[PDB]
Ligand binder design. Structure first.
Ligand SMILES: *Cc1cccc(C(=O)O)c1O
Lengths: 244, 97, 200, 261
């Protein structure tokens, strides 16, 4: 009962590299679709599959292919990735197609970034900044800030962990990253998040706070030739303890 | 409920001996759709015989036109032979002029 | 068909009502869909119209006029969780979907007791950055981008302390320059006159 | 214009004889086939040259995909019907959808299904409901009526889309569809015979002494002659014990004809 499952969530590619996105649906649907979503325009269909055993081009098939492997699976292939294929890809399915009022069911999306060279790829630096004493005395609340900075591409997941458990209450993370150098096309990114708690919670010396950032970057097979460390997929974090 | 074919045999134009024409066999009203149709000349099967694609009626039955070019004479006898699941033996309808 | 149009962005206040418009010009019409898509998430089906009129579903209604080639999505009693993009899509004569570019809906929280202040956060021993938090301002306040290439300012973000049924706006500014002070971090913004700046 | 219609048919067969397609779909404008698809070709193709000449390859490519999908759906529905009827052997499933644009400008729309060539489900686009003829159909009725949007969708298709398609195809085929070939009529029991006419709609009858005698008249079928035109006849038996004036009356495309015998 998982609905539409597509992988991977994130992928960085070098121009010319090949890539397959997977999609499966467990809803016994007959129709499946691959879309790309880009800023400033509506979803564009790449290829679709009206039924098991047939597929056809959508609006933007060039650079792609598909395989309806079986009733459940519809894979999308980028044989030779190009920078223009930097996009967010969505798998979707419907019970039938061209049949009445049936809606689409979407996968979680796959963010692809295609680069001429991987020299631009950096993990974030992650730092945590403890609450202002002035805030604490003025409001009886305490805001921690986490900064994730210098990363590229924008393939990150930031979370807060309190006493070893992820939390969402009291958390606000920027919905979009800041370009550290707005006028550059390849600018590295920054992301801020806050976690606000009661002063009494902050003032318990055994409460533990961690900001964690999952970065999606290179894998073993990606070639690395720079002097700096290979920017592999990795978790970068920083922490703070409460203080009395 | 299976419906037996109505079978009608007729020339395209009013027949005149020695004048080229078309012999038609219109088979209609039948269900289900599988059916076999031959045109006969003097009791034997004509080989160059055309037919329209299976056609659909609003009452869910089917129809077909079978035809062949022919020059009628006074001696030659023509017919349509049809078999269908509703028919025990093939049904022959002769061309009546 | 050939095109579909909807506003790029709309901003309304918590508790209020908003109407998101969608117009379309198509070769034929087989239905109009609205989808919701939270930032970084999958679109999800919201509504379908195909004959003329208004249809209600909870706090959302959707309207269609086929002759005007027009639909709206009506959201009542706005909550913060309604912040999302809303996508309009029309099925044409050949049952192909044509997708609008989407409307980003931004919701201003209702800030009960505004207490605007700029605080300096504690330095981290692992970072050369100084960090300033502009917080607790009312939602009419807009946070401007930095005018200094070595100062970074993020936009306002609404956090919900649910346990206390308490929401608040904040923006973050940081820099590693000697120049940088919280007293001047947000100088390029129009901030409330009564903004609290505690002494350093 | 005269009355015109657009109709699309589907046929599914559950256990077909070797080589014979399990699925066939044909569209018509009036009596003219315009499109065809089946499970053997797996291609949707024009059946009239005025369809081929006005619809680009991308039209046929797209409807080829759709029909491949609709083929599969028809198989699934038939399988469910034959399961619930508890029937063995080969059975048939049929759909007909269509609309008419009447001479006076009014429209009709219809959608129905059949199992083994008998009415199964009939759509009412005004009350937005399905008429079920038995309890297998009744089960499907409940499922199909469960989402109102489905019903609304077909109403819209039938009343707007179908009529729009019909008007488009009428213009494409106007040299064929809107022409008139008047009948040649002769008398030859008295037989009145007409041939060479188009459209196929014709009304022939016999009157005796200026009065019509409907149930003493034998009405022949309107039949294709094979060259695009049609033929038909009507007969009546002679009373040899009384003198009577017999006349054949023929109406065709706004023209009346009388042949006095
Ligand atoms: C090709 C076509 C167009 C519209 C509708 C149908 C149908 O079968 O209902 C078909 O076949």
């Amino acid at each position: 009962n998982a609905g539409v499952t597509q992988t991977p969530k994130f992928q960085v590619l070098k121009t010319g590299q090949s890539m397959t996105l997977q999609c499966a649906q467990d809803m016994n649907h007959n129709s499946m679709y691959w879309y790309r979503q880009d800023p400033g325009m509506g979803l564009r269909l790449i290829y679709y599959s009206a039924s098991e055993g047939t597929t056809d081009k959508g609006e933007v098939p060039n650079g792609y292919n598909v395989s309806r492997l079986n009733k459940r699976e519809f894979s999308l292939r980028l044989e030779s990735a190009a920078p223009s294929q930097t996009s967010v890809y969505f798998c979707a399915s419907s019970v039938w197609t061209g049949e009445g009022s049936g809606e689409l069911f979407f996968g979680e999306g796959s963010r692809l970034t295609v680069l001429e060279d991987l020299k631009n790829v950096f993990p974030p630096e992650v730092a945590v900044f403890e609450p202002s004493e002035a805030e604490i005395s003025h409001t009886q609340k305490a805001t921690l800030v986490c900064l994730a900075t210098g990363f590229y591409p924008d393939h990150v997941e930031l979370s807060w962990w309190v006493n070893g458990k992820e939390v969402h209450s009291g958390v606000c993370t920027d919905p979009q990253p800041l370009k550290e150098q707005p006028a550059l096309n390849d600018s590295r990114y920054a992301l801020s998040s806050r976690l606000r708690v009661s002063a009494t919670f902050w003032q318990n010396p055994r409460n533990h706070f961690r900001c964690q950032v999952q970065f999606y970057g290179l894998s073993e097979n990606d070639e690395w030739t720079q002097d700096r460390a290979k920017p592999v997929t990795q978790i970068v974090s920083a922490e703070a303890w409460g203080r009395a | 409920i299976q419906r037996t074919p109505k079978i009608q045999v007729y020339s395209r134009h009013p027949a005149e001996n020695g004048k080229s024409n078309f012999l038609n066999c219109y088979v209609s009203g039948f269900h289900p759709s599988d059916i076999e149709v031959d045109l006969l000349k003097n009791g034997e099967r004509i080989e160059k015989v055309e037919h329209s694609d299976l056609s659909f009626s609003k009452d869910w039955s089917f129809y077909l036109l079978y035809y062949t070019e022919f020059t009628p004479t006074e001696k030659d006898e023509y017919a349509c032979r049809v078999n269908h699941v509703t028919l025990s033996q093939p049904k022959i309808v002769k061309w009546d002029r | 068909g050939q095109n579909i149009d909807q506003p790029t962005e709309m901003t309304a206040t918590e508790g209020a009502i908003v109407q998101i418009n969608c117009t379309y010009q198509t070769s034929g019409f087989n239905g109009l869909f609205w989808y919701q898509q939270h930032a970084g998430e999958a679109p999800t089906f919201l509504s379908y119209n195909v004959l003329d009129g208004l249809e209600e579903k909870g706090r959302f209604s959707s309207f269609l006029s086929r002759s005007k080639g027009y639909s709206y999505l009506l959201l009542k009693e706005l909550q913060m969780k309604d912040s999302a993009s809303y996508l309009c899509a029309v099925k044409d004569s050949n049952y192909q979907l044509i997708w609008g570019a989407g409307t980003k809906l931004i919701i201003k929280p209702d800030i009960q007791n505004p207490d605007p202040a700029v605080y300096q956060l504690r330095d981290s021993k692992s970072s050369d950055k100084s960090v300033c938090l502009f917080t607790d301002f009312d939602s009419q306040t807009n946070v401007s981008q930095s005018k200094d290439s070595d100062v970074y300012i993020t936009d306002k973000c609404v956090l919900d302390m649910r346990s206390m049924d308490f929401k608040s706006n904040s923006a973050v500014a940081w820099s590693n320059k000697s120049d940088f002070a919280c007293a001047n971090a947000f100088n390029n913004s129009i901030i409330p006159e009564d903004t609290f700046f505690p002494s350093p | 214009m005269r009355t015109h219609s657009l109709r699309y048919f589907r046929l599914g067969v559950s256990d077909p004889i070797h080589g014979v397609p399990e699925f066939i779909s044909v569209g018509y404008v009036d009596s003219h086939p315009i499109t065809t698809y089946d499970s053997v070709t797996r291609q949707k193709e024009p059946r009239a040259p005025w369809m081929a000449e006005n619809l680009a390859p991308d039209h046929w490519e797209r409807y080829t995909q759709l029909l491949r999908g609709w083929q599969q759906m028809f198989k699934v529905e038939l399988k469910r019907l034959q399961r619930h009827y508890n029937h063995s052997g080969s059975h048939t499933y049929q759909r007909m959808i269509g609309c008419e644009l009447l001479e006076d400008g009014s429209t009709t729309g219809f959608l129905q299904y059949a199992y083994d060539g008998q009415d199964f489900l009939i759509f009412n686009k005004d009350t937005l409901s399905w008429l079920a003829v038995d309890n297998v159909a009744h089960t499907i009725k409940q499922a199909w009526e469960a989402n109102q949007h489905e019903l609304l969708y077909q109403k819209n298709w039938l009343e707007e889309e179908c009529i729009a398609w019909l008007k488009r195809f009428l213009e494409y085929g106007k040299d064929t569809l809107q022409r008139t070939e008047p009948p040649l009529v002769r008398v030859n029991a008295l037989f009145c015979k007409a041939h060479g006419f188009y459209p196929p709609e014709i009304y022939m009858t016999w009157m005796k002494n200026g009065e019509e005698i409907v149930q003493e008249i034998d009405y022949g079928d309107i039949l294709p002659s094979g060259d695009g035109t049609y033929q038909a006849w009507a007969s009546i038996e002679l009373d040899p014990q009384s003198s009577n004036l017999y006349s054949c009356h023929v109406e065709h495309s706004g023209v009346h004809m009388v042949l006095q015998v």
